Design a protein around this ligand. Structure first.
Ligand SMILES: CCCCCCCCCCC(=O)OC[C@H](COP(=O)(O)OC[C@H](O)COP(=O)(O)OC[C@@H](COC(=O)CC)OC(=O)CCC)OC(=O)CCCCCCCC
Ligand code: HEM
Ligand code: HEM
Ligand SMILES: COc1c(O)c(C)c(C/C=C(/C)CC/C=C(\C)CC/C=C(/C)CC/C=C(/C)CC/C=C(\C)CCC=C(C)C)c(O)c1OC
Ligand SMILES: COc1c(O)c(C)c(C/C=C(\C)CC/C=C(\C)CC/C=C(\C)CC/C=C(\C)CC/C=C(\C)CCC=C(C)C)c(O)c1OC
Ligand SMILES: CCCCCCCCCCCCCCCCCC(=O)O[C@H](COC(=O)CCCCCC)COP(=O)(O)OCCN
Ligand SMILES: CCCCCCCCCCCCCCCCCC(=O)O[C@H](COC(=O)CCCCCC)COP(=O)(O)OCCN
Lengths: 431, 126, 55, 352, 352, 126, 55
């Protein structure tokens, strides 16, 4: 297992695996939804569905290729997959359809049909997908009036004002050679890829991207979307967390692993070594929860999400969870830290060593764009093993004890108390 | 207050000793006959206080034909007590019917609660 | 429902001395608690009337 | 007792035990579902709480999975802890306790939740209907437990003694040294299991053509067709399922799903149409059947099928139906049909 | 507007209005059920509470009844109060209010109770399946409302304006002077109704033979067969239904029920087998079908059928299929079949 | 306390009189503008006290799109009151929007309760 | 649940002065009722200490 970075004008990164049976080749750009403004929000999500449109997918399918695309807050990628003997055809398809010609894809008949399909997807997301849209509303209230607040899909109000000239204006500012990384994963050797690119003279455009002026900033706030005709309540809560390239990046992920995830209907999930589960199962305070530690280029979020049918005891669920977060400053034990070390290593090993080269192409390109290289899994395991109890207590005294929070919620949330009752539970008046 | 695991540990030590089972076992038979619960139609496991989580677990796991018969013996003993009488002598519990029917369910629930308490307050070593 | 269960002050009376479920086998030793309530009323009422004449 | 493994320079390993004990071998309705929920409960030597706390400190988890052919027991763990997980999987097959209070408190409430989740999906209930009217006894058995046949605790223990035998299972490992795995298996309680017999039948299963069934349901409407496939025709219907859901076909916007389930003795092709308005469902399924009866040319989709087969086979032990080069044409013959939802406004079999 | 009556020296009278508005004419699923529960609700001139209090002091009651052909409005009362009840039945057909709060608070909770009672009887759900697979649109419509098609308040008022017409109803009276009844009807609001058209079709309905359906159910198991009957064969199948459930037949201990439903254009013969153990149901239905295929002689049961027909026709207006003298033989041909309950242990159509 | 049937009987008598509708109707328009509920964004039917069985019946029968809009006006008026402010002038209720939306549901429930009370305490004669 | 809701004497305290739902728009006129409770305590406590010296 080894990565190889090489620059000749174009940054080329590979990750060779001679045991895999497919190969994957694409390009990742270093702009996401946090490089848009409130008037062209959704222009990245439209460029994805233009690339995945029917006439473009049909040209690829006669060659034997498949297409993927992903939109995030800091990056976006466009990936072609094939059998290991036809990576030259997949690199040709990325040259013709995406680099040279774009007036074929941006015809008026293709643009209006794609815009209709995207507007239906965003409408069905806002009406049916309740856990993921509460987490989207948590980002917009915590980073309000700041580039990290814009949703990755766009809104229905901002998507209908978009024309063809808005997509060409975004492509001239961000789809550049100094913003791009060419990636290759699966069964493909590194020097075979750099000689196929150098046998041509690929270059997107010369110049740099615009520089935004407002930096990300956390603000303690809340947003409530009450809907009494829904059968549950869905709540997210977080503090300000760690960015990428932070010295406390792995300590924050281990602290979330201490409290973990839960499913009340799976019998083995009920037997986990988490002390919070004693209070919750006595009166059945929720159906599921999960803790997270998200990281971006400038900021991050640390907290949990939950879903509940017990709508008269919502205040007991928030109170018991926040009293366990107080113990990370005061009285976290050594056996809880050793359990979280083994489970964080199992979770990280499953994320980076799945058998999908499309997942590996997204992870490799996003990390080379920020850091310039990639940290191996062997070196990440040695940083996790060196964390002590005193590292956890010093991190939680800075980020958790007596700090501001952000709350989002939907459904039957009448039993959720107001902000200052929840804010005062971030300290004990004992220590 | 004293657990049934502790009572069975002391009691099985006496019953294996051939010299201690000649002294204490005749005294225990006179103690039970002077107690008089069998003349009201009760077994000893009907007399155990039930307002605790271990006993509520063991009473849930009892088979339902034995749960119906336990409820009739308790109700008949309350009615005999308020009339200030005893049962007729052909309705008394015999010694070969005074068996510990609830004791294996109690000992199983006590061992599971002890193992959970040891895993929740635990040390490690490298 | 009946008025002894719906009124705010009579439901406290009804759930304590009217409809409260008692075990069927308690004997006369369980009557001492209500005699103590009568004794406290007797000591309070004879106490006020004597205090009108005491120095 | 077949043992095989593959190796890699990878941090994470996976171990699996494949038992021929799926719902096609079940004695009563839903017994294979209730045995699947009894796995990793209390053992005679170790409680289920002790197994979760011990493997969390080593970094491993357990899972059990049921389909129509297999019961699969799986572990995922850090690589150097292999002999702990060989012995833990052997104790489940050998000395599961089967306590009566475990059936009441854990197994039966977990199986009621599995049935209630799958009951709200009309695509899943249309697939259950298509298996029942095509094969009628073996592959047509119901997958989950619903309680129309009552299953006692002794029925579960009799089914466990029928399928957990040495001639009826195979052991596989990923990122595992093969010479170390064969040594740890021979020292474990797997070699102390009864020999028994293999349950896998050799002959072709009996099938039926031209059947119909209609179910009323509150929600979306589904129309679905199903074709049974023999072993010599598995390559032709695999190209057809990838062609119909790709951009090479003009019918792909009307089709919700299409796939081919494969077994060692044959398979079943399925196709689904789903919408909340039943006038759209009736218009879509009439155009699909009429266009497939005229005939299609499948040879432009051969290279696309070879890519999709290699992606899917990275988790499977690869039944090699890999000669796609002889696939040229297809014309629709006789088939089965089910309708779920607003059945007063859905077509009949002789109307299409 | 047909009016007829019979007279007697009797204290109690009965008045009925028969509308051709059953479930075989319904526009959506369950609209005829919801119109039947709207009868004797609030009128534009009189509330439903006022109608109950006034007729109780006179000694009378009202009722509405739905079947597959008719909606029937009925009154039973003391004899000399006839003009009050002619006018009360005329106001229901003419000026029912159809308030939106009456649909929410009264009509829809009453129709949910009707559906939940009939859902627990597997004999009734087997008869609903036999009608659906025999006729498929007219007589195969569902009888009750379950909510797979939503019915608005405007849908109910459109169905009431379609069936409450003068060419679509008939008035009948028992223990009623006929010359007085024709005078009170012509003075009432029934003569102010629209003329409209009759909904009764003249031709034979379309039927289907050799169909099958299976439903899973927790409870008793039912096996049932069904035969469609034309108009010239109604006398033969009436003798067969009385012969099979009498002491003249050795098969009567195995049969739970057998009857013949009659209409003006034909009928449907049914037979039912019910037991809580499905091995008894499978043994019973195999002996019934095999013995009916060899042939039976029906002529010893003719005089017994003429007695049973006269007892049943005392409440019916007597469709005269009364020539039982030509009935000699019967041999079973093609038929339809349904199975409800533990369907894994019940026979299939080609096995019997 | 005074029923809406009695209020509508007095009020419709004034509005049909051509001499009484020239005197009282200018006084009633000054009375409503001095009340000031429209500057908080309320209609008059939002102000009716609801803790009685007639008003609970009428609020159940209101269509749901009007029930959602009534709940927003009450919540917005509580928030404006605690800040000791008034709404912006472009958010005030206009006179052509101050319609009696709840009055036909109230009058229908009052007439049904009066007819039930007359039939429950009733005389007969031969 | 929390101990302030499960205890027999603390749940009366919790439902009256801790968790009781108040309307969000009440003004300072709604504070007079709790001042009357403070006045009654002041009159009772100064009354006992003066009664130790009174004839
Ligand atoms: C007798 C011994 C008892 C002593 C204590 C009793 C107090 C009785 C006073 C009467 C009363 O309770 O009602 C007061 C009422 C105002 O009610 P509101 O909620 O609408 O005003 C909230 C304010 O805008 C924000 O008030 P905020 O909370 O922002 O600041 C507090 C303010 C002082 O507040 C008080 O002391 C309340 C009594 O602090 C400042 O002034 C800052 C500069 C130092 O006032 C009125 O409605 C009319 C004003 C004259 C009332 C006098 C009538 C007496 C007979
Ligand atoms: C639980 C309640 C009470 C108890 C146990 C109690 C007990 C006593 C006793 C033992 C004496 C001495 C009697 C003697 O031997 O002469 C006494 C005297 C007295 N008590 Fe009480 N008392 C109670 C309530 C009250 C109350 C509430 C008052 C006044 C309002 C009161 C007023 C007096 C007076 C004035 C005397 C002196 C007159 C006398 O000697 O009888 N007592 N009390
Ligand atoms: C609601 C409670 C009370 C009220 C409104 C009240 C009121 C009064 C008033 C108006 C006076 C006359 C004061 C003066 O002008 O000098 C007085 C005197 C007195 N009260 Fe109270 N009282 C209360 C409670 C009590 C209690 C509970 C006690 C004894 C335990 C008590 C003991 C006395 C005494 C000893 C005096 C005479 C000394 C003096 O003049 O201050 N009071 N009370
Ligand atoms: C197990 O179930 C039971 C149960 O079996 C029983 C019997 C009782 C009832 C028994 C009791 C003892 C309850 C009654 C309590 C008392 C009688 C205590 C007395 C309480 C007081 C507050 C004493 C104050 C009473 C007075 C009369 C003082 C006032 C004096 C005055 C007005 C005279 C002065 C007037 C002038 C003009 C000088 C239960 O409550 C109960 O629980 C549900
Ligand atoms: C709508 O929501 C509300 C709400 O808005 C408010 C304001 C309250 C406020 C509650 C109160 C104001 C409480 C009311 C006050 C009382 C009940 C006071 C009662 C008075 C006493 C108990 C007097 C007792 C005094 C003594 C025993 C002192 C005795 C003196 C001694 C012992 C001297 C010491 C002797 C020696 C020798 C040293 C609510 O409870 C409430 O919920 C419903
Ligand atoms: C915590 C310990 C202290 C509690 C003590 C509880 C016992 C108190 C005395 C009980 C005696 C019953 C008093 C009469 C009950 C009838 C009250 C009534 O009719 O309610 C009112 C009349 O209002 C009054 O005038 C009350 C006067 C109270 C006088 C007490 C000194 C009408 O009855 P209502 O319809 O409101 O009933 C529903 C209540 N939720
Ligand atoms: C006459 C008017 C009466 C009005 C009553 C108002 C209530 C006044 C109480 C004020 C608060 C008192 C705090 C009590 C502390 C918690 C109770 C407790 O500790 O109970 C017990 C321990 O028992 C005791 O020692 C009681 C102490 C006597 C208290 C006498 C003042 C706590 O243990 P437990 O687990 O049983 O609590 C759950 C009870 N449902």
């Amino acid at each position: 297992a080894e990565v190889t970075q090489l620059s000749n004008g174009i940054v080329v990164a590979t990750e060779h695996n001679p045991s895999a049976h497919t190969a994957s080749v694409g390009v990742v750009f270093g702009s996401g939804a946090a490089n848009e403004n409130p008037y062209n929000n959704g222009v990245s999500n439209l460029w994805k569905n233009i690339f995945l449109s029917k006439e473009n997918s049909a040209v690829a399918a006669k060659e034997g290729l498949a297409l993927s695309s992903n939109i995030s807050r800091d990056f976006q990628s466009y990936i072609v997959s094939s059998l290991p003997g036809s990576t030259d055809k997949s690199l040709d398809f990325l040259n013709q359809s995406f680099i040279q010609q774009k007036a074929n894809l941006l015809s008026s008949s293709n643009f209006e049909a794609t815009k209709k399909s995207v507007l239906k997807q965003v409408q069905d997301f806002e009406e049916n997908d309740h856990p993921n849209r509460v987490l989207e509303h948590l980002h917009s209230t915590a980073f309000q009036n700041t580039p990290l607040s814009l949703p990755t899909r766009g809104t229905l109000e901002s998507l209908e004002n978009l024309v063809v000239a808005d997509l060409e204006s975004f492509a001239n500012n961000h789809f550049l050679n100094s913003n791009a990384v060419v990636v290759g994963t699966g069964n493909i050797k590194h020097e075979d890829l750099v000689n196929s690119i150098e046998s041509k003279n690929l270059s997107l455009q010369t110049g740099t991207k615009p520089v935004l002026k407002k930096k990300a900033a956390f603000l303690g706030s809340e947003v409530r979307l009450r809907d009494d005709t829904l059968p549950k309540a869905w709540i997210s809560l977080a503090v300000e967390g760690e960015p990428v390239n932070s010295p406390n990046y792995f300590v924050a992920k281990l602290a979330a692993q201490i409290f973990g995830s839960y499913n009340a209907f799976e019998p083995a999930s009920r037997l986990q070594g988490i002390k919070l589960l004693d209070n919750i199962q006595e009166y059945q305070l929720c159906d599921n929860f999960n803790h997270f530690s998200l990281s971006y280029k400038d900021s991050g979020l640390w907290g949990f999400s939950t879903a509940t049918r017990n709508v008269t005891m919502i205040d007991d669920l928030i109170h018991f969870t926040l009293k366990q977060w107080n113990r990370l400053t005061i009285s976290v034990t050594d056996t809880e830290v050793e359990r979280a070390k083994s489970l964080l290593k199992l979770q990280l090993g499953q994320l980076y060593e799945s058998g999908n080269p499309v997942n590996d192409a997204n992870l490799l390109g996003a990390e080379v764009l920020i850091k310039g290289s990639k940290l191996s899994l062997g070196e990440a395991f040695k940083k996790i093993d060196a964390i002590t109890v005193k590292d956890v207590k010093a991190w939680a005294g800075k980020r958790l004890w007596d700090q501001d929070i952000a709350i989002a919620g939907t459904g039957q949330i009448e039993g959720l108390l107001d902000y200052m009752r929840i804010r005062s539970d971030m300290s004990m008046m004992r220590w | 207050p004293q657990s049934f695991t502790s009572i069975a540990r002391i009691g099985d030590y006496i019953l294996k000793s051939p010299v201690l089972s000649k002294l204490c076992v005749p005294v225990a038979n006179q103690f039970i006959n002077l107690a008089g619960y069998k003349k009201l139609g009760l077994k000893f496991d009907d007399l155990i206080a039930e307002e605790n989580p271990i006993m509520q677990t063991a009473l849930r796991r009892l088979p339902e034909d034995e749960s119906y018969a336990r409820a009739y013996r308790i109700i008949r003993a309350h009615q005999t007590e308020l009339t200030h009488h005893l049962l007729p002598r052909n309705e008394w519990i015999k010694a070969q019917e005074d068996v510990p029917y609830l004791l294996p369910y109690i000992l199983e629930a006590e061992a599971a609660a002890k193992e959970k308490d040891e895993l929740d307050n635990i040390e490690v070593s490298k | 429902m009946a008025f002894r269960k719906s009124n705010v002050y009579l439901s406290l009376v009804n759930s304590y001395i009217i409809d409260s479920p008692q075990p069927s086998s308690i004997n006369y030793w369980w009557n001492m608690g209500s005699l103590l309530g009568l004794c406290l009323v007797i000591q309070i009422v004879t106490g006020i009337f004597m205090a009108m004449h005491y120095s | 007792l077949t043992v095989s493994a593959r190796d890699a320079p990878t941090k994470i390993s996976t171990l699996a035990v494949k038992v021929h004990g799926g719902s096609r071998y079940a004695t009563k309705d839903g017994v294979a579902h209730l045995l699947n929920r009894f796995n990793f409960q209390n053992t005679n030597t170790r409680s289920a709480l002790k197994l979760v706390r011990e493997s969390e400190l080593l970094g491993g988890t357990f899972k059990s999975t049921l389909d129509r052919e297999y019961i699969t027991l799986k572990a995922t763990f850090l690589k150097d802890d292999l002999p702990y997980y060989v012995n833990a999987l052997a104790d489940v097959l050998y000395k599961t306790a089967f306590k009566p209070h475990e059936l009441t408190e854990s197994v039966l409430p977990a199986a009621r939740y599995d049935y209630a989740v799958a009951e709200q999906c009309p695509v899943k209930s249309a697939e259950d209907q298509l298996y029942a009217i095509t094969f009628r006894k073996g592959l047509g058995n119901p997958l989950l437990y619903d309680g129309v046949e009552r299953v006692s605790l002794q029925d579960i223990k009799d089914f466990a003694d029928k399928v957990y035998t040495k001639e009826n299972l195979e052991v596989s490992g990923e990122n595992v040294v093969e010479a170390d795995l064969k040594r740890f298996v021979d020292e474990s309680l797997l070699s102390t299991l009864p020999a028994g017999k293999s349950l896998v039948s050799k002959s072709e299963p009996k099938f039926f053509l031209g059947e119909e069934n209609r179910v009323r349901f509150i929600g979306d409407s589904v129309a679905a067709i199903g074709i049974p496939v023999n072993k010599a025709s598995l390559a032709q219907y695999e190209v057809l399922a990838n062609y119909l859901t790709s951009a090479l076909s003009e019918l792909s916007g009307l089709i919700s799903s299409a796939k081919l389930d494969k077994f060692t003795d044959g398979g079943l092709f399925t196709l689904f149409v789903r919408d909340q308005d039943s006038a759209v469902v009736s218009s879509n399924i009439k155009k699909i059947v009429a266009d497939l009866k005229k005939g299609k040319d499948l040879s432009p989709a051969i290279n696309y099928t070879k890519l999709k087969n290699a992606v899917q086979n990275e988790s499977v032990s690869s039944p090699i139906e890999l000669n796609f080069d002889a696939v040229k044409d297809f014309k629709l013959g006789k088939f089965n049909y089910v309708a779920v939802g607003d059945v007063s406004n859905l077509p009949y079999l002789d109307e299409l």
